[PDB]
Amino acid sequence: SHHWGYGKHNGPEHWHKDFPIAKGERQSPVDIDTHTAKYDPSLKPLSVSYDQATSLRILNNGHSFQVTFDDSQDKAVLKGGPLDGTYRLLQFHFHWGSLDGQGSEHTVDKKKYAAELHLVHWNTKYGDVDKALQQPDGLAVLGIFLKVGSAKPGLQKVVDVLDSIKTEGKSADFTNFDPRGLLPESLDYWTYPGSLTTPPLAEGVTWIVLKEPISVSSEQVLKFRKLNFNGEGEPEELMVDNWRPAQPLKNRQIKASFK
Ligand SMILES: NS(=O)(=O)c1ccc(NC(=O)Nc2cnn(-c3ccc(S(N)(=O)=O)cc3)c2-c2ccccc2)cc1
Ligand SMILES: [Zn+2]
């Protein structure tokens, strides 16, 4: 639980009072203008190595729900692309809307998607996530857009346990989940230096945003929208519209992995 949230009185336009870096030089998310982004032939191939991923728990944290992973060894890692070295998967979570036309944090030519998946990784050269959070290259987030259409079979195990974590602070066992089932076919991406999109809004994230969205069904996203921001026995306030709007690009260049 925190004072910050996504409502009128505690939402993104308020965050700068407790977290002044909200008005910083490298905030996220941003609008990705596909006609300004530069193809970068020097980007190395992107390597998503999730075959040994060990999921642990699923948790409603009051601002999203997250699936956590064992990051005590190199089990599920991201390498290559714009990254130097090895980044370990810690958790994934989502952002979504009240209607299918909004929910994503990144936008593409101002287009908003129904939701956005964030797979959060930290740079093993800093030894733990707490230390990585203080570095300009400490974190890498793989962002994947969700559109409503056909169901995503690899999401259904998540959807089916959400009624066990309805309110803030609820958690459940979530072992043997394979995050490979959440990925689109293509790893074509855009990349730029940015920040966490929630407090503390730390400016230490390399963003990698895949061009290809995954499709999920209307029934799948409807189940996200039944979650609650509130803890058990407080007024019911649906967990919807837990996205930060696009921020000023300032002096940054978005690079593309593809022509
Ligand atoms: N491996 S483990 O022990 O089970 C484990 C597993 C995750 C955590 N903690 C955790 O995930 N904290 C937390 C909650 N939300 N966020 C968070 C929020 C926003 C973004 S976003 N939209 O991608 O910019 C990314 C991450 C985190 C977090 C995680 C790492 C660094 C900073 C924050 C602690 C322990
Ligand atoms: Zn996120």
Side-chain angles (χ1 to χ4, degrees), residues 13 47-48 127 175 235:
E13 303 315 308
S47 175
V48 184
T175 54

Side-chain angles (χ1 to χ4, degrees), residues 63 66 69 71 90-91 93 95 118 120 129 141 196-198:
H63 47 96
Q66 66 183 83
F69 289 80
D71 61 345
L90 178 69
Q91 59 111 300
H93 65 271
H95 305 267
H118 287 163
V120 184
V129 67
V141 184
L196 295 177
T197 68
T198 60

Side-chain angles (χ1 to χ4, degrees), residues 200-240:
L201 301 168
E203 289 183 337
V205 179
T206 301
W207 277 95
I208 302 169
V209 175
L210 296 190
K211 173 156 172 203
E212 192 173 6
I214 60 167
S215 303
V216 299
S217 64
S218 57
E219 295 82 5
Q220 289 181 316
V221 69
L222 281 168
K223 288 174 180 177
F224 289 13
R225 299 187 182 126
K226 297 182 71 175
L227 294 163
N228 289 181
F229 283 127
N230 50 278
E232 195 175 8
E234 311 189 299
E236 177 178 54
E237 296 302 346
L238 293 180
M239 184 180 285
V240 294

Side-chain angles (χ1 to χ4, degrees), residues 183-197:
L183 307 179
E185 285 181 2
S186 181
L187 291 181
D188 289 347
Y189 63 86
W190 299 281
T191 183
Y192 77 96
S195 73
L196 295 177
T197 68

Side-chain angles (χ1 to χ4, degrees), residues 66-229:
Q66 66 183 83
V67 173
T68 64
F69 289 80
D70 177 6
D71 61 345
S72 68
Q73 300 180 75
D74 282 352
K75 286 186 160 195
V77 300
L78 190 60
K79 300 165 54 61
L83 302 175
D84 283 350
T86 297
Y87 287 68
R88 280 188 189 153
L89 178 67
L90 178 69
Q91 59 111 300
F92 70 75
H93 65 271
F94 301 80
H95 305 267
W96 64 91
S98 52
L99 302 164
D100 295 350
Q102 64 198 67
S104 68
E105 295 203 310
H106 296 89
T107 57
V108 183
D109 297 328
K110 300 291 167 102
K111 179 178 170 70
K112 296 170 166 146
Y113 287 87
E116 192 173 328
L117 165 61
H118 287 163
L119 296 129
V120 184
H121 311 74
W122 57 274
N123 188 334
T124 62
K125 73 193 261 218
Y126 298 122
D128 67 64
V129 67
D130 322 82
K131 185 62 169 173
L133 182 63
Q134 297 166 51
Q135 316 303 322
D137 60 345
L139 304 175
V141 184
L142 178 60
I144 304 175
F145 295 117
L146 276 63
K147 65 176 183 180
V148 172
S150 301
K152 189 68 169 181
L155 182 57
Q156 191 63 32
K157 279 176 184 192
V158 170
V159 163
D160 278 333
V161 293
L162 292 181
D163 59 0
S164 76
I165 63 154
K166 185 185 198 182
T167 52
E168 184 280 310
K170 298 198 94 209
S171 68
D173 181 279
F174 205 65
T175 54
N176 300 291
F177 180 77
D178 190 346
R180 292 174 300 180
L182 296 178
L183 307 179
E185 285 181 2
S186 181
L187 291 181
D188 289 347
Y189 63 86
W190 299 281
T191 183
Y192 77 96
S195 73
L196 295 177
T197 68
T198 60
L201 301 168
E203 289 183 337
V205 179
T206 301
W207 277 95
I208 302 169
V209 175
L210 296 190
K211 173 156 172 203
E212 192 173 6
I214 60 167
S215 303
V216 299
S217 64
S218 57
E219 295 82 5
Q220 289 181 316
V221 69
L222 281 168
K223 288 174 180 177
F224 289 13
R225 299 187 182 126
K226 297 182 71 175
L227 294 163
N228 289 181
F229 283 127

